[PDB]
Ligand binder design. Sequence first.
Ligand code: NA
Ligand code: NA
Ligand code: NA
Ligand code: NA
Lengths: 445, 445
Amino acid sequence: LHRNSLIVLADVALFLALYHFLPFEHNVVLGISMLAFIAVLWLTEALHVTVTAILVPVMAVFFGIFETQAALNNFANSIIFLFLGGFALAAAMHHQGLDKVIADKVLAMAQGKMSVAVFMLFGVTALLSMWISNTATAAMMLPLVLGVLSKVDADKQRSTYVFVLLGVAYSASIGGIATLVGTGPNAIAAAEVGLSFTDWMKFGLPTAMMMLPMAIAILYFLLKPTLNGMFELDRAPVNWDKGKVVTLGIFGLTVFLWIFSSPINAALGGFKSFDTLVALGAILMLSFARVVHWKEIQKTADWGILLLFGGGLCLSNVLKQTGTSVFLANALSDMVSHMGIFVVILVVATFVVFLTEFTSNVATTTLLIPVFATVAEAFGMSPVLLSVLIAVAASCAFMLPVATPPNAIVFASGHIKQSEMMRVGLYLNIACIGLLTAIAMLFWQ
Amino acid sequence: LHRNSLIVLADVALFLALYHFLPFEHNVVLGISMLAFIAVLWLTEALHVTVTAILVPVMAVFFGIFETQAALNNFANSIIFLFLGGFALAAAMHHQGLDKVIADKVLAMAQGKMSVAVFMLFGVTALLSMWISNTATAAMMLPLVLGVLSKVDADKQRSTYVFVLLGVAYSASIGGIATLVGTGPNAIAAAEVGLSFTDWMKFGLPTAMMMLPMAIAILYFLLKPTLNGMFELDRAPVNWDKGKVVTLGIFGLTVFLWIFSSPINAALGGFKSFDTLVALGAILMLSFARVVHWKEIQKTADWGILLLFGGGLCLSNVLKQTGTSVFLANALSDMVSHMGIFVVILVVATFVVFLTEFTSNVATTTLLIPVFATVAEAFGMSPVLLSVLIAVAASCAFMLPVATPPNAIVFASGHIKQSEMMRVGLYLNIACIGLLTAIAMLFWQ
Ligand code: NA
Ligand code: NA
Ligand code: NA
Ligand code: NA
């Protein structure tokens, strides 16, 4: 009866059709049929992204691709735990309120000017996003933005107070592209290609550094009348209490180890997934130091995403084992050799940047990274480039809401028009396809 | 400064002491020192049970027992997922309110009599517990019990209304010993020795059937004046709405497959952890049938316990790999051969039944099952017996509150005295040590 129940039934039909009708060696048919099936379910979101994630192994197993345990093992991948460590680290500084104090301390640095208020609102949203989340950083910033944009209250004077709402909802998404914790895609890239925390920062941070000015410049150079206004610093001020200095201390130590993971680990006897251990060491320090309880981390942790990661890793392995990765590489062989590597990464960059407007950031990365990385490997090229690219571009959701929760959060502010966001995003999208294809060309040799 | 911070520091000291001072082959020292360290942390609960669980792998890995990934893989064990399926199945019938309707439908079967009210209150709490939880079934029953015990309101007439409060808090714990979903210990036993869902029901259900009458008989034959009273059926009645019949349908189908897993799987081509698949198939059916959203399952699921499971599995493997399992078997060799198998299981049964009053149900099972099962295997005996026994006896917490949340829930009802519970539990404990040692002897050949 429901829309989504039909999409599912239509998909079951599609699979059954592809399964019986495709003219290839059995394994490839199965792999293709599965790929299409999952592809739909994550794009349409007829079933919750995570339910789909769980579906991958159960299928794999039933269609004899893997044994039950072999398939589930995917879910305990070390990056998944690294991300859990990220969730715990966030949970700590939110419950501690260290996110609030970094907001006030930097926001009250601006004396009483709306000019240097919003520019410091974007700079904080981005810096906080690096470690916390997007969905979380946005919902946490909304009250702080509405507080400031209440002096220039005139909402007949909209474009003063739309530049700042849409400003943070992008700064949350751009701040995610900074480190391996922050947004899902980055994790799925790292898990697929085997990146360290300090590896994904070498890519992402430059890109975030580049993109945030480029994004504000585009919002600015539409309709900004914000060089005017005054402040209302209205609420109780903040102060470092029982180890908000300790949470920062652990955080600092954790981030330190993460950056210097390469020499620290090497000069420690080279432990296997060192970053994940650092992330668990975080969980342990944070608990021994009593600074955050567990019930907090259980609420903060998005187990749905943690599960999703594994569902997609499983998929990747389904593609390899069935030889679907190699079959597609053969199929694309003529096309990709006729295309330049510029052409390819331009097409890839464009495809996602717009496909991410329709669908969930992760859901698409969980779909695309496996297909692309594994096919790239069949061609005997380094799957890293394409993967990192997909992961970044997936977080380039700037057009409509429903693209990312940060978009839908500043939108529910019953003010910003559908039409408005759609065309700033349309510019920013293209702006990015440039910047990415540009940077992706520079990170080659 | 805090109590627990010192316990931890004292433990760090203890480890360091055992590590440097024990006079054995390196591996055994390491294994022993670890075993002791963890043993403390789970018994004292100086760090949250789950934080300790995470500590196992991080140790294992740092002390070169396992590689980082190999260690984490423990957490994706198929039973862990089977339990997640249980959490989803529960989440469904609670959000759907199918737990409420099974309460009313059976409670309103009793026309207006307190005699057949409380006897049907225990029978429901136990039946609901089989699938839901203990902590959850208890907190869900408390309002339904206080509703009934408001006609015989006279709390100078306490022992009418203490027999029923303490009655359900035991019926929740006894109902847990029925199936593989229900309480943690049962899962940790199944994961350790490789039990099917239908395997742990062959043990547990008879034991629950036996124990519930035996427990009420002991509460009854203390201070019961409840053959008197009348009903106040006060609140809106219940009715089967949008697929409360569907939730029951899936539930029924799931439970059906679980029981008949053996012939269904065998006549299907023998898939590996069939029960876990059935449990995931539950999650999928429940979502396709739209009957429960995911955000619900993420709230219901105790990820803390799911993580704990893996922490203990890891431990077990730490014990094997270091040969600590074999070293202890050699150490106990003279003692256990001097003891009868009766003597042994009597000592085991007694030890836990009382140790579970001081500590968390799971925490102790996660500690003891590994030690006992792996040592039992070194003796070349079937680790099943001792394990099942420990898992059951761990859920025999009847004395003080803080033993189980169900105990602490009916206690916060600002009525039942410390002294009262402590001596009913003291009888019921001994009563069980009999029943278990009795049954455990019968389940031999
Ligand atoms: Na982020
Ligand atoms: Na998106
Ligand atoms: Na239970
Ligand atoms: Na207990």
